[PDB]
Design a protein around this ligand. Sequence first.
Ligand SMILES: Nc1ncnc2c1ncn2[C@@H]1O[C@H](COP(=O)(O)OP(=O)(O)NP(=O)(O)O)[C@@H](O)[C@H]1O
Ligand SMILES: Nc1ncnc2c1ncn2[C@@H]1O[C@H](COP(=O)(O)OP(=O)(O)NP(=O)(O)O)[C@@H](O)[C@H]1O
Ligand SMILES: [Mg+2]
Ligand SMILES: [Zn+2]
Lengths: 769, 463, 52, 53, 52
Amino acid sequence: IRGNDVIFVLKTIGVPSACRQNEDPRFVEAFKCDELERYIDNNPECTLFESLRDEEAYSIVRIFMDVDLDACLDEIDYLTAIQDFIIEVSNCVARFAFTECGAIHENVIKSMRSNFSLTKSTNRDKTSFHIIFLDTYTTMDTLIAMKRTLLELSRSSENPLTRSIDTAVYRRKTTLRVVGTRKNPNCDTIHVMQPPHDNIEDYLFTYVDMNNNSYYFSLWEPGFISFEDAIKRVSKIFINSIINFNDLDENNFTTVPLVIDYVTPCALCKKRSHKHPHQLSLENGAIRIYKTGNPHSCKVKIVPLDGNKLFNIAQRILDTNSVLLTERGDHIVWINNSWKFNSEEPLITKLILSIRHQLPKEYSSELLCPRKRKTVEANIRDMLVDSVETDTYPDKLPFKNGVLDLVDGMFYSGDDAKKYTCTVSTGFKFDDTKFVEDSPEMEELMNIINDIQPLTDENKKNRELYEKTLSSCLCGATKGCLTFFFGETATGKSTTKRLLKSAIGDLFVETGQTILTDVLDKGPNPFIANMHLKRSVFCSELPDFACSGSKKIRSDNIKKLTEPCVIGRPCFSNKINNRNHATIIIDTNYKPVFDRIDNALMRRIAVVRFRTHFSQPSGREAAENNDAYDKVKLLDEGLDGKIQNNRYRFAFLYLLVKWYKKYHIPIMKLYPTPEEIPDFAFYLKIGTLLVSSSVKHIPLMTDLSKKGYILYDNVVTLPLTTFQQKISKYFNSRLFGHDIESFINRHKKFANVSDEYLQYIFIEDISSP
Amino acid sequence: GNKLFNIAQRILDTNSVLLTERGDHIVWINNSWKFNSEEPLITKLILSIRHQLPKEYSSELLCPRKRKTVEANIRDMLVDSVETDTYPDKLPFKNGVLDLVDGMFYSGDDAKKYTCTVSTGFKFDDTKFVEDSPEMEELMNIINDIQPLTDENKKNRELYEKTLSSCLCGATKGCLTFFFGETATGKSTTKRLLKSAIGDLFVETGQTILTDVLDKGPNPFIANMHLKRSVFCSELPDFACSGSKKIRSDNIKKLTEPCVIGRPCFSNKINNRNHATIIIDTNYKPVFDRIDNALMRRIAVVRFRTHFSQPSGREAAENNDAYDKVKLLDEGLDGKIQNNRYRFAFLYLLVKWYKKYHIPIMKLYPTPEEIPDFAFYLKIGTLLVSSSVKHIPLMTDLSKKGYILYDNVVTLPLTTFQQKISKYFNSRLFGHDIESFINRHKKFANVSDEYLQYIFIEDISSP
Amino acid sequence: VETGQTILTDVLDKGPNPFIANMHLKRSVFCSELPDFACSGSKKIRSDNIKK
Amino acid sequence: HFSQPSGREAAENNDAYDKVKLLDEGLDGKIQNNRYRFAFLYLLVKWYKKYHI
Amino acid sequence: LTEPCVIGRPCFSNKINNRNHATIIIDTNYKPVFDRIDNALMRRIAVVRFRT
Ligand SMILES: Nc1ncnc2c1ncn2[C@@H]1O[C@H](COP(=O)(O)OP(=O)(O)NP(=O)(O)O)[C@@H](O)[C@H]1O
Ligand SMILES: Nc1ncnc2c1ncn2[C@@H]1O[C@H](COP(=O)(O)OP(=O)(O)NP(=O)(O)O)[C@@H](O)[C@H]1O
Ligand SMILES: [Mg+2]
Ligand SMILES: [Zn+2]
């Protein structure tokens, strides 16, 4: 809504609703930056509060909090406290935004932690301030919802600043004090600004200046603890007996000073003795222990009265969005700049141990006992209810140390890569130095590629399709066609398989022929179960069926593999569905033959040609005489070893990325080539030469009758003997009699005359006069 | 005392955990009965219902040991079992239940009463269940193209609507329907329309149970089709093959019972519930191993006429025998339907047809007139009549027509009966059927005489 | 309880047989849709199966 | 036989039947809802006493 | 069997992939007879003869 730049101000607290509606200038005002500054300057002792003029259109506000701690802290304690407070509050708000407002935890963290205005009250007995997050915007109903979780965080933390969060001022018509202005006419203390923020729009929670680095999102109690245990905790922290004992009741808790015999130095500040004795106060369900008189002689102490420490630790670990539950009931953790999941060995305890550095020291020491880490893991599993979607951005290449942007070539490492929840990684680290164009390895790889597929004019299209198929493996989406690497021996299909394996790493799996032969549903099929979020799978050495004795590759499997999802379950699992981002590549020396052929199969089969031979010098002319190759090149033997050494990995990766960039016109697809595999040629020629019967061709019987055709009940039918006599001049029986009878029975209708009749006419006959 | 026992009693009072007749538990978290046995959800539920508890009780549920103790108490207190989803007129969506009687959808505790485990797998939105939409108008045009509203295609349209709408009812269906067409006549179009519509309650498969023997087998499909409201059987392999297996009438009858007998893969369960509307889409004419009166009662046929042709193939496809209308293709139609745009509009259309055809029952009625061999089998009965007492007094007067008398019963010799019937059907096509009828209704008394207790209707009619 | 036709057609001992195993202490057993012998090559009911 | 009123005459001439009645469309649902459970149980017990002296 | 990776897992162990560092030798009294003969298979078979 482009925000607002007018500041609405009330003067006196408790102004009437009638006065607010009438907008009487005696109390109601509206200014801009310069007008506000001039008003504050000219009128020094005027009260100034900020509110919302409209809750129906300008509900957009910033993220703000109020903290007031009734104690004095020195500089170092103040700095560590504010650091911990910022981290905890930003994590809590980001987790709430992610889990309720549908926002993104990482941009929320970035916007809240980039900059903030932090004032300081001129009063010296206490530490109070307002904090404004400039670049985070949301509606007021969002704060309405945030109230509960912010109160829970306030109640469940030891930090004085976080514990002293004012959970009010999150209501309707909420009014915030204006900086530099007294709250009461009879008081003098005010709030003053702190560097590097010096202007006045930096401290107003309604002023909106949305820019690039911005983000917006939208949608003694008897139950605390036994009093004896509370006093026991106080004494146990004191580490010394108390002179005034058995006289402090529940009623005189906040009145009677406490006196300590200084046998051991006061553990709060290690000082040998204190002039004035120590006293207790009850704030927000915690006992604050302080010393009267000197504000810096003793460090203030916090004793909680409720909650569970190992539950607070688990909540703090959970609200960093580093453990998540997927739609398949598996827990993914963010360790070492990657998303990892392992059903065999859960990694939650590893995450708990590793994440202790991003937690306050009080919670840090508890995460060293394996028993307590197991307790925290048990808490986390119970809190993780509901699931989240993963791997939804098909433009990113996930490396073990980050994410490479395919549309740009920019590498994101660390938290920047955390947004893209890519749960499968190549397994190795990206390297920008080795991801360069000019390199001797690059020239060697270009030589190899041009050797395997020449750039000749005849080969041009096949080489381009080679590039297309190799590039589309990088796509994280689902493609609608398979690729067959058909070629003769010693031609480089296994070499390019090894090249892709080295280039893609763990985003690559090799499976057997069971996928192409057996039923995919069946029972336990870990081969199908291994294609989860893969991008390149390989089936090698398809057992071709030139001789009878083996079940042919079934069409059902190849139709099912094209689907965006695949139905299949592993051993001892309940999930039945896995996403199909993988490109299915099968290596064979022979033409595959499918059991059932129909129309749809001409939209799924793309094959790649290999016509280059690498041979020993002895078989030079022996290979040259063969027509299986169009060129013979000498064979290099250490090339396999150096490829196994992953020497060409980054060169081939750069080449693939450039191919993807070139081929990636907005959205990309794959197209079959149903003219190379020979078993489809039968049906192609039959379709281009034979068509079914017709009813709209009824006023065209003259030429058919002149040729010799007969008419019956408006359906063209002819005997089988003359069908064979007519077809004997196009197809030979000794060639494909099995296929001939196959389609004959497929289209048999029987009836008519005294023999079977079929609904078929010849395209050549109707084409001829 | 025993705060933990009190907590367990309080939780069990809300009926959030149930024990089903499979020796397993179902829990209600996130407004859905998510049965899970591999990993229990009871501790998750215990931690979830924590703020609906007194403050002196909420603090004890933060310890995993105490949560496990409460779960053990609940497991010991359950004891009894309940029945799973029994309401047929309730469609369960991932976030509630939709009553088809008033088309009203409700979630929360109001949807807890209908203990439905199976679900569509996708959420339901209130603001897209509307009559007016670009999706609505485009879908209406598509259906009006596929099934024209002309008075010739009236009963076919009614059958299409009824069978399509029956996929929502959670009862058992007594008929198997056929989608008959020639080539690309919207078959897979309406199949993928249903897949987009319901989802996770529709199973697409080819042959298997339709072709093989159901019993004496480890076949998984029979267990797969448990509590699924729609099942499609496609790509039937042209049983007019002379070498390929036929269709079993016993298989058809097994598929048309409230309970289906099957042995999934490795377990010992042998019975499963049948709710699916089994739809079989074929181009070639199906042929059964053995047809009879009982089989003819369980088959319905829906014919597909209007076809779509590309601009280039328009002249090629504009002349077809079984075509009735020619229209144009659409390259982005399949991707667009996979974009789930027509989902809720087609749900509303299915609900409307369901309300139309429940008055107040939607029993599926067989249509045997479409199948020509069924027509031959029934015309044999219409052109004949079994011998009865009314034919006894005739005797000699009817025997003058070319018949004889056997035990005061009008009888015809087998050879003369064959000569008489040979002038109606085609011998080449119906020789096996004639042999089948002869061996199915034969009567013998001695070495020579062979009796048939049937008389032609035209012989009786003619003076 | 309801069971398939294998009870009358196939070998009772063989390997596993939950169809037979489920008849423990059941007061009534039903089998439906007898496989008409009108199809050549069909199986036959076993007299020893009846006796067992 | 229990038939619809259209094919009633077509199936009457069959010798496999001695009687023909009108098919009832509510029997399946009424049985599925366990309406006749205790009535059939009472008849079964009466027949048991009759035929097991 | 000549590829650098093989698939198979032990009992009570979720480890599937195995490396292929092996020289595969088969000692026989008879020459092997293969179902399919092609130019590719000829690149993977060698025979040593024992004649004492
Ligand atoms: N550009 C190249 N320059 C030199 N040697 C090469 C080149 N490309 C491949 N080779 C080598 O030539 C041989 C070809 O073997 P291979 O890669 O297995 O082909 P192939 O078609 O997969 N053999 P096969 O699986 O039996 O059909 C290997 O030793 C490669 O290292
Ligand atoms: N109303 C329409 N307008 C334009 N194109 C349409 C329309 N309806 C269908 N089509 C197209 O025509 C095709 C018809 O094919 P369809 O009948 O659904 O599959 P099919 O070929 O019969 N499957 P199968 O029977 O196994 O061969 C659809 O896939 C669409 O591409
Ligand atoms: Mg190879
Ligand atoms: Zn001290």
